[PDB]
Write a protein that binds this DNA or RNA. Sequence first.
DNA 1: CCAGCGTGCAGC
DNA 2: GCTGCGCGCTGG
Length: 138
Amino acid sequence: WTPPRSPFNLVQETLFHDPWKLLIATIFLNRTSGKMAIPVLWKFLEKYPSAEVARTADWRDVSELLKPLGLYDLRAKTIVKFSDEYLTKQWKYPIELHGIGKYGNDSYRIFCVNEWKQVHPEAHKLNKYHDWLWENHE
DNA sequence: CCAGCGTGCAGC
DNA sequence: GCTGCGCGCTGG
């Protein structure tokens, strides 16, 4: 499965090959603008390039990176616990993991697996992308 | 000036 | 179903 590139330019379109990075991006976009979250995301992935490095991370360090975005302590602690769970739990769908809910699970299901047809999103940009997929289908 | 909002989520 | 978290951003 290769989720196609769209005129919406969802960050998920580039991070689909690495479910962890794609799921971390979803966390970054939780009630936060793309224009704001995305540049911080690249600096985060520079410092914490894998779930292995992030599960070991000190949340206060992650918090300092997340400071301008808001939800800095909640998400720094959520990032660390999510990364640990991501590597320890024997999960099929990421909604089973701490910090991933309907939105991140719908992104995984559209982008990391070929299950978009079964997904019913409720996130603005993801809805636009998902509606566009059903339209430009065949 | 200052309220509303951003590709939510856990926990009660 | 409700509530806390939360900044920086934009607009009457």
